[PDB]
């Protein structure tokens, strides 16, 4: 994709901290950038759209290469169009913005400078942030996560990609998404079909695969921490159903792990721990600490989670499911959880902890998003039962308190139009350097 010249692109400033063993902390001047899919995409020779709603202009985009030559991503009005506001160390994302037209959700990335994403290697470190999920009801997901996107957005070896990280180009994840307009320096017009339900989306012939660390997927009801492995941790292109992932007819047939090794306190049997008025009280802001412990070789062997609220350090809840113990993500936990729940261990199949180690060594980009779910209504995160016809007595079926009929986008895009998430006070450093409390 090309650089559009009709609207200035100014990345909202966002500060975040680096801490050392001490724990003294200093402030980094980061910037955030909107993902390329949300942008106006128009001809390089004027204002004619290359894509509108769910449909490509086939004169501008007769094939994937020509489309990339002809089409430019332009600047974004972060607050006015997308409901994205950055102030100091806080980033607020609104679910619905009624601008000149309606916008639903957003996905953003943390930038080092105007043309490069910040990258992270969290091995033997922790990543910490504050979040307010009080405005997120059933069906919403404020996701803060990491994927090994190219720091430059792919421009170095993609001649038809001039827009790069400056315009939020280069996304990939463990679902191998085919709804992306640009993948690896080419458009995705070939094979495009508009979505059956969403007016804003569709699926092209190709998907964008990579490893994925879901540090945080949550609303006010439930939260999940989920690493996902991949054969190749950085971006690869896939085609059609062979992609695997959410919008494939053969979910597990691809080169990535679309399920991950998840820890949701509620799904792991503790329904008193996370939610409204619970131990981690989602009515108010809290701190989320995620630690990435290594073995003697420097390979990831454990992900620990702590919360801090009202000045109290709260260890992650113990899994209470018979056969699945502990309160952290380890190989023992992942093996046990998949065996006991009767889920395919695609996490292990695509390299598990070694894959995530390799993802960190490649360099992870921080993603902050807010979305609803046109595939499964977020029921996998927050439903009394997922699948909806499964027995709630069966371990692993219950994930939250939301009804099986909750979270339908056409419903919640009206009823939850006030929804929002605020991520703030990001801190990164050695283990135990980013937080304190009793
Ligand atoms: O065309 C003008 C029209 O544009 C919309 S903006 C619109 C984009 O055009 C469209 O490409 C994307 S598709 C988007 C999808 O809606 C969203 O549900 C998923 S959420 C995704 C999440 O971000 C990730 O964090 C998570 O890991 O996976 C989730 C599921 O994939 O992302 C898709 C893109 O990758 O949708 C936007 C918004 O509808 C303007 O809003 C509108 O006003 C204008 O008329
Ligand atoms: C991206 O997906 C498109 C659409 O499926 C692929 O397009 C096919 O490409 C082959 C080889 O060039 C052609 O023979 C077919 O005619 C194309 N099919 C269609 C429907 O257009 C394309 O190959 C994919 N790109 C990559 C890099 O995998
Ligand atoms: O595909 C949507 C959603 O999937 C989860 S994995 C999910 C499986 O889909 C389900 O079969 C099993 O019973 O539960 C697991 C865990 O919830 C994945 O973690 C997530 O990334 C994705 O959005
Ligand atoms: C597609 O783009 C061409 C070239 O700019 C333009 O002439 C035409 O009106 C557009 N067609 C549609 C259907 O948008
Ligand atoms: C960090 O603190 C946690 C919780 O208090 C403790 O379990 C752990 O031993 C500490 N780790 C280090 C490296 O100090």
TrEMBL record:
It is an enzyme of class 3 (hydrolase). One of its GO terms (molecular function) is cellulose binding. Residues 390-410 are annotated as: Disordered. The keyword Disulfide bond applies. Disulfide bonds join 19-25, 50-71, 61-67, 138-402, 172-210, 176-209, 238-243, 261-334. Keywords: Carbohydrate metabolism, Cellulose degradation, Disulfide bond, Glycoprotein, Glycosidase, Hydrolase, Metal-binding, Polysaccharide degradation, Pyrrolidone carboxylic acid, Signal. It catalyses: Hydrolysis of (1->4)-beta-D-glucosidic linkages in cellulose and cellotetraose, releasing cellobiose from the non-reducing ends of the chains. Mg(2+) 2 binds at residues 64, 206. Glycans are attached at residues 57, 196, 432. GO terms for cellular component: extracellular region. The modification Pyrrolidone carboxylic acid is found at residue 1. Mg(2+) 1 binds at residue 64. Residues 401-410 have a biased composition (Polar residues). GO terms for biological process: cellulose catabolic process. Its EC number is 3.2.1.-. The keyword Hydrolase applies. It comes from the Eukaryota. Belongs to the glycosyl hydrolase 7 (cellulase C) family. This is Glucanase.
């Amino acid at each position: 994709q090309q650089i559009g010249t009709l609207t200035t692109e100014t990345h909202p400033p966002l500060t975040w901290q680096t801490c050392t063993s001490g724990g003294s902390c200093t402030t980094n001047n980061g910037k955030v950038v909107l993902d390329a899919n949300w942008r106006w995409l128009h001809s390089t020779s004027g204002s004619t759209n290359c894509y509108t709603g769910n449909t490509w202009n086939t004169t501008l985009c007769p094939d994937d290469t020509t489309c990339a030559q002809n089409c430019a991503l332009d600047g974004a009005d972060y607050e006015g169009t997308y409901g994205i506001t950055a102030s100091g160390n806080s980033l607020r994302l609104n679910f619905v913005t009624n601008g000149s037209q309606k916008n639903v959700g957003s996905r953003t990335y943390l930038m080092k400078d105007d043309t490069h994403y910040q990258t992270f290697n969290l091995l033997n470190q922790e990543f910490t942030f504050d979040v307010d999920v009080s405005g997120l009801p059933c069906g919403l997901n404020g996701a803060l996560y990491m994927v090994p996107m190219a720091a430059d957005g792919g421009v170095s070896n993609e001649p038809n990609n001039k827009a790069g990280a400056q315009y939020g180009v280069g996304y990939c994840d463990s679902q191998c998404p085919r709804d992306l307009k640009f993948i690896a320096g080419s458009a995705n017009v070939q094979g495009w079909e508009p979505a059956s339900n969403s007016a804003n989306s569709g699926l092209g012939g190709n998907g964008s695969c990579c490893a994925e660390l879901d540090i945080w997927e949550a609303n006010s009801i439930s939260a999940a921490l989920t690493p996902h492995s991949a054969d190749t941790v950085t971006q690869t292109v896939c085609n059609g159903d062979d992609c695997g992932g959410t919008y494939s007819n053969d979910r597990y047939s691809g080169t990535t792990d679309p399920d991950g090794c998840d820890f949701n306190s509620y799904r792991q049997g503790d329904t008193s721990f996370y939610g409204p008025g619970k131990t981690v009280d989602t009515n108010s802001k809290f701190t989320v600490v995620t630690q990435f412990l290594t073995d003697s070789s420097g390979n990831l062997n454990e992900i620990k989670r702590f919360y801090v609220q009202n000045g109290v350090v709260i260890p992650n809840s113990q899994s209470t499911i018979a056969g699945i113990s502990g309160n952290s993500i380890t190989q023992d936990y992942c093996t046990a959880q998949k065996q006991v729940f009767g889920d395919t261990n695609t996490w292990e199949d695509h390299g598990g902890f070694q894959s995530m180690t390799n993802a960190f060594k490649a360099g992870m980009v921080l993603v902050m998003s807010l979305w609803d779910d046109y595939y499964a209504d977020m029921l996998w995160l927050d439903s009394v039962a997922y699948p909806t016809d499964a027995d709630p007595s069966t371990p692993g079926v219950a994930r939250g308190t939301c009804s099986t009929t909750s979270g339908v986008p056409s419903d919640i895009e009206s009823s939850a139009a006030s929804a929002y998430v605020i991520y703030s006070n990001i801190k990164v450093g050695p283990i135990n350097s980013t937080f304190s409390g009793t």
